[PDB]
Amino acid sequence: RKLSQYVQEMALGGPITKESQPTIEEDLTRVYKAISAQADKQDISSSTRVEFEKLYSDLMKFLESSKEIDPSQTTQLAGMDVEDALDKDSTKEVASLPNKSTISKTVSSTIPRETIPFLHLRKKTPAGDWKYDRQLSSLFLDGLEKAAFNGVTFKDKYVLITGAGKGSIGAEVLQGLLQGGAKVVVTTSRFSKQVTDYYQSIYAKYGAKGSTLIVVPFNQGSKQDVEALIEFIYDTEKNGGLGWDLDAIIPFAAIPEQGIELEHIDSKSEFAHRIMLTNILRMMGCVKKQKSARGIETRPAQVILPMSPNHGTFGGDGMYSESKLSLETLFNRWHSESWANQLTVCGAIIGWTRGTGLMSANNIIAEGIEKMGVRTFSQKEMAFNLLGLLTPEVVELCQKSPVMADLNGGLQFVPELKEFTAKLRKELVETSEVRKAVSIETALEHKVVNGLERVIVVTGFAEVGPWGSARTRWEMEAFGEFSLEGCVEMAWIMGFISYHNGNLKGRPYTGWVDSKTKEPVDDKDVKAKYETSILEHSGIRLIEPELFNGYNPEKKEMIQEVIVEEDLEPFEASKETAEQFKHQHGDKVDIFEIPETGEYSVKLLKGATLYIPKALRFDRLVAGQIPTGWNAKTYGISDDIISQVDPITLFVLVSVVEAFIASGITDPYEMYKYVHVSEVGNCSGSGMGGVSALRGMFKDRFKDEPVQNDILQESFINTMSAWVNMLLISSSGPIKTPVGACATSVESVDIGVETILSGKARICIVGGYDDFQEEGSFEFGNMKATSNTLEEFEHGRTPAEMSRPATTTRNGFMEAQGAGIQIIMQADLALKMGVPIYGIVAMAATATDKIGRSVPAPGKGILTTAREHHSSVKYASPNKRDPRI
Amino acid sequence: LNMKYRKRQLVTREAQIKDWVENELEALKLEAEEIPSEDQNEFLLERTREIHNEAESQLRAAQQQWGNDFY
Numbered sequence: 001r002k003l004s005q006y007v008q009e010m011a012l013g014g015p016i017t018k019e020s021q022p023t024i025e026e027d028l029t030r031v032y033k034a035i036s037a038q039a040d041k042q043d044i045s046s047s048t049r050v051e052f053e054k055l056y057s058d059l060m061k062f063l064e065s066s067k068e069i070d071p072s073q074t075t076q077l078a079g080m081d082v083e084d085a086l087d088k089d090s091t092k093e094v095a096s097l098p099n100k101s102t103i104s105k106t107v108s109s110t111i112p113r114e115t116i117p118f119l120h121l122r123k124k125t126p127a128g129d130w131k132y133d134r135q136l137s138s139l140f141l142d143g144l145e146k147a148a149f150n151g152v153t154f155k156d157k158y159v160l161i162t163g164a165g166k167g168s169i170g171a172e173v174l175q176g177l178l179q180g181g182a183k184v185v186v187t188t189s190r191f192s193k194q195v196t197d198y199y200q201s202i203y204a205k206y207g208a209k210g211s212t213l214i215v216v217p218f219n220q221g222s223k224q225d226v227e228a229l230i231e232f233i234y235d236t237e238k239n240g241g242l243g244w245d246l247d248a249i250i251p252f253a254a255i256p257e258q259g260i261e262l263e264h265i266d267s268k269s270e271f272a273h274r275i276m277l278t279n280i281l282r283m284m285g286c287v288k289k290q291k292s293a294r295g296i297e298t299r300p301a302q303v304i305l306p307m308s309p310n311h312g313t314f315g316g317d318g319m320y321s322e323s324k325l326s327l328e329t330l331f332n333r334w335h336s337e338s339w340a341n342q343l344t345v346c347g348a349i350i351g352w353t354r355g356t357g358l359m360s361a362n363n364i365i366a367e368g369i370e371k372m373g374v375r376t377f378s379q380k381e382m383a384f385n386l387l388g389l390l391t392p393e394v395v396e397l398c399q400k401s402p403v404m405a406d407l408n409g410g411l412q413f414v415p416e417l418k419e420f421t422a423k424l425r426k427e428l429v430e431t432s433e434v435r436k437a438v439s440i441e442t443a444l445e446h447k448v449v450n451g452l453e454r455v456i457v458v459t460g461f462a463e464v465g466p467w468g469s470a471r472t473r474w475e476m477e478a479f480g481e482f483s484l485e486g487c488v489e490m491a492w493i494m495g496f497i498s499y500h501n502g503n504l505k506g507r508p509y510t511g512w513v514d515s516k517t518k519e520p521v522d523d524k525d526v527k528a529k530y531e532t533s534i535l536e537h538s539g540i541r542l543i544e545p546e547l548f549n550g551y552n553p554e555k556k557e558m559i560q561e562v563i564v565e566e567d568l569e570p571f572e573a574s575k576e577t578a579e580q581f582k583h584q585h586g587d588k589v590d591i592f593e594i595p596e597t598g599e600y601s602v603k604l605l606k607g608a609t610l611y612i613p614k615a616l617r618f619d620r621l622v623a624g625q626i627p628t629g630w631n632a633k634t635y636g637i638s639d640d641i642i643s644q645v646d647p648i649t650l651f652v653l654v655s656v657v658e659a660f661i662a663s664g665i666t667d668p669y670e671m672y673k674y675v676h677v678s679e680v681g682n683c684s685g686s687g688m689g690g691v692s693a694l695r696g697m698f699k700d701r702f703k704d705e706p707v708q709n710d711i712l713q714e715s716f717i718n719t720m721s722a723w724v725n726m727l728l729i730s731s732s733g734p735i736k737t738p739v740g741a742c743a744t745s746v747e748s749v750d751i752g753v754e755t756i757l758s759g760k761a762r763i764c765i766v767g768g769y770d771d772f773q774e775e776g777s778f779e780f781g782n783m784k785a786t787s788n789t790l791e792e793f794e795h796g797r798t799p800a801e802m803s804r805p806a807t808t809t810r811n812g813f814m815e816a817q818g819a820g821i822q823i824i825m826q827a828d829l830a831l832k833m834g835v836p837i838y839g840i841v842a843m844a845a846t847a848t849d850k851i852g853r854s855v856p857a858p859g860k861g862i863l864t865t866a867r868e869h870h871s872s873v874k875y876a877s878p879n880k881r882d883p884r885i
Numbered sequence: 886l887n888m889k890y891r892k893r894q895l896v897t898r899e900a901q902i903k904d905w906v907e908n909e910l911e912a913l914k915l916e917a918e919e920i921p922s923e924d925q926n927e928f929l930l931e932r933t934r935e936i937h938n939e940a941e942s943q944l945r946a947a948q949q950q951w952g953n954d955f956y
Contacts (some may be wrong), residue, residue, distance in 0.1 A: 879886040
């Protein structure tokens with residue numbers, strides 16, 4: 001035990017050693033050499049660290065699946081009532097004579113008082129209770145001696161665990177088996193994203209060479225759910241699957257049931273007795289009924305049931321300890337009931353765990369109970385003893401006889417623990433009450449007294465994706481939160497923040513602060529510690545799903561507007577205005593619906609069977625409602641251009657200018673004093689969509705709701721690329737405009753990069769818009785590749801996730817509004833009064849060369865293997881047409 | 886090839902283009918008068934500011950390959 005720079009890093013070293021993967025994790029670690037540039041002392045130090053970590057890892061390829069060892073220093077307690085107002089301390093001292101568990105091996109052996117050891121192992125007693133038999137007490141102590149230094153292996157074990165999350169002891173039990181390499185599944189009651197990601201890192205911190213994990217949501221009580229999971233863990237692979245054998249089982253409890261004496265046999269306290277044995281006692285029964293139906297008799301299942309010694313000892317227990325002392329009948333049931341060739345019970349009575357993450361009862365004293373009586377267990381890593389009680393060469397004894405092992409280290413030997421618990425409680429809080437009463441008046445006794453040349457350069461760019469500007473989503477990639485100087489810029493857009501609050505007319509006197517929500521809550525709203533949690537999650541969680549009401553334009557998304565037709569035959573004689581009967585009389589033939597004339601009025605109306613109105617429908621759609629927007633869009637744009645120009649063109653309009661300030665060129669008339677003959681110019685806009693008013697070109701014509709008299713101008717795909725020209729930077733030169741969508745926005749660059757290598761043109765832009773609408777489904781969703789909830793609601797609830805690529809969980813991808821922009825230069829002019837430089841231009845994509853007979857095919861080796869062509873007929877000797885490189 | 890090679894950059898160019906720039910204005914010296922010297926400075930402003938860019942672009946014609954159109 002000589003830990004320093006290592007320690008926790010040394011624990012990572014064992015963790016690195018565990019998941020070996022033969023010749024896999026060698027080679028990546030072998031390229032810790034490779035670029036080992038000895039120019040950094042840090043690099044040279046790690047170079048020393050390189051081979052040593054490579055050494056043992058080379059020495060453990062094909063081995064037993066790691067230890068269970070805890071290299072962390074051993075602990076005890078550190079409860080202190082200090083001098084001043086510093087009352088109660090806490091815990092985690094250092095524990096005298098400890099650190100290493102090997103040092104804690106023999107320390108946990110020859111124990112004091114007048115007992116067998118610090119952790120005995122009794123049995124039946126001739127015709128009585130639990131005599132501390134040394135023979136059973138031998139090997140268990142030796143198993144820990146077979147631990148620490150020696151490893152602990154757990155291959156092919158396949159266990160389920162009831163035991164809940166963070167503070168539970170079964171959490172650390174789960175930590176052991178994945179380190180030991182078992183394939184363990186785990187149930188829980190609570191299921192959410194918060195439940196999910198916690199069971200990602202534990203798998204990510206403890207995935208050893210043969211370790212998989214399954215999280216299942218399942219309520220342990222209410223038996224109508226207990227059958228199916230026990231079925232699901234044993235079914236045929238041509239059914240739900242998971243055809244395992246379940247070699248061991250440890251269920252743990254829940255449900256505290258505190259502060260209630262004998263008088264309360266009423267409800268949800270009631271629910272514990274059904275869940276602490278009654279679902280449980282059927283569960284070990286039914287697993288035998290599952291096992292012996294198949295006939296797997298040579299391989300029984302070992303259970304470890306938690307017990308407790310404080311039966312009738314502590315106070316207002318209710319039914320907790322009292323249902324607990326009903327388990328021990330399982331021992332004598334292991335004779336005179338035919339299930340002994342299938343199961344095995346070995347109890348565990350565990351007592352008095354320190355370590356409040358959760359459920360460390362009376363986490364205060366822990367130390368005076370190590371003196372008045374010298375007895376141990378302020379130690380939270382007692383599961384190290386528990387993890388020995390699954391190991392083979394012990395399971396052999398479990399195949400002989402059941403084992404009662406008092407894992408409680410000797411607390412039962414004090415008489416009258418109850419007031420003895422209260423006695424240090426009633427004094428040490430009382431001792432704090434002394435100096436606390438001293439301290440305040442002493443200050444009160446004081447206080448009353450006083451008072452070259454064709455290289456192409458990335459220059460400017462600004463994406464408006466589903467998040468904010470192009471400075472936003474880099475940081476949201478970089479951090480989960482928004483990082484205040486990043487946060488207010490996100491808070492600028494959506495209009496929650498009301499920048500330029502007014503340098504005057506504040507609170508009647510002076511005072512201006514960049515404030516919020518222009519005139520609801522304009523009140524002075526400081527840029528500091530606020531706007532986190534006064535402009536958060538309401539300010540955050542509106543840019544994701546249900547897409548909205550009142551946005552696109554309404555799109556209720558459980559109410560679909562389909563037009564079914566019908567031709568009923570009752571008659572109406574309704575009314576109307578003049579001359580419009582004729583486009584009802586052109587529309588329908590004469591013999592139905594003669595009009596009349598509407599005397600001193602407009603006209604008149606209806607008649608026989610009429611064969612119309614094709615009324616309406618009410619229809620529900622599953623696949624939709626995933627992406628969204630940002631609830632405010634007008635930057636400094638010209639008003640009443642925006643009555644005609646809306647649906648996508650604003651996005652590319654706000655794109656280019658924010659790319660230009662990022663590329664440092666305000667006022668793009670500034671270019672023309674780098675005098676040309678001005679034959680240098682326009683972009684390469686793209687996107688299949690931009691429909692977004694073309695829906696009005698078809699659903700809003702012959703149906704007659706207000707459309708402006710010219711919509712076919714903004715119908716096209718170059719019309720946006722027209723409006724970047726005349727409404728902005730106003731060139732005369734070349735125009736390309738590809739489309740190439742579902743793989744767009746690159747050939748625009750790639751033919752755009754062909755433009756600039758030719759001397760035909762200079763400084764240019766590329767497109768990148770697309771859009772979502774009503775008709776953005778339906779041939780989407782009906783294309784069955786797009787997205788579909790309900791199995792993105794069902795097994796994954798997950799509105800925030802909804803999509804994780806390369807997972808097998810993918811059922812459909814997603815897309816949203818989006819707006820992306822880039823600009824490009826000849827790079828010699830980019831040295832001429834620099835914009836400045838960002839990137840470097842590499843590829844030349846876009847040639848399919850494959851003609852099957854279907855559409856489409858995602859990216860495996862379809863194309864771009866004509867790219868990187870770069871053939872290798874016989875050269876063997878180093879140093880356009882060029883068939884080599 | 887794939888190194889910072891620049892050898893055939895410096896040998897077969899930066900010498901032959903270095904050669905007929907000495908040898909190119911002298912070809913104009915063969916047509917020096919031809920009974921101009923009524924418009925000699927005109928042809929200096931005509932012909933000699935052509936050939937310097939031709940001396941410039943031909944070196945840039947090498948600057949296609951050898952690193953910039955290397956393959």
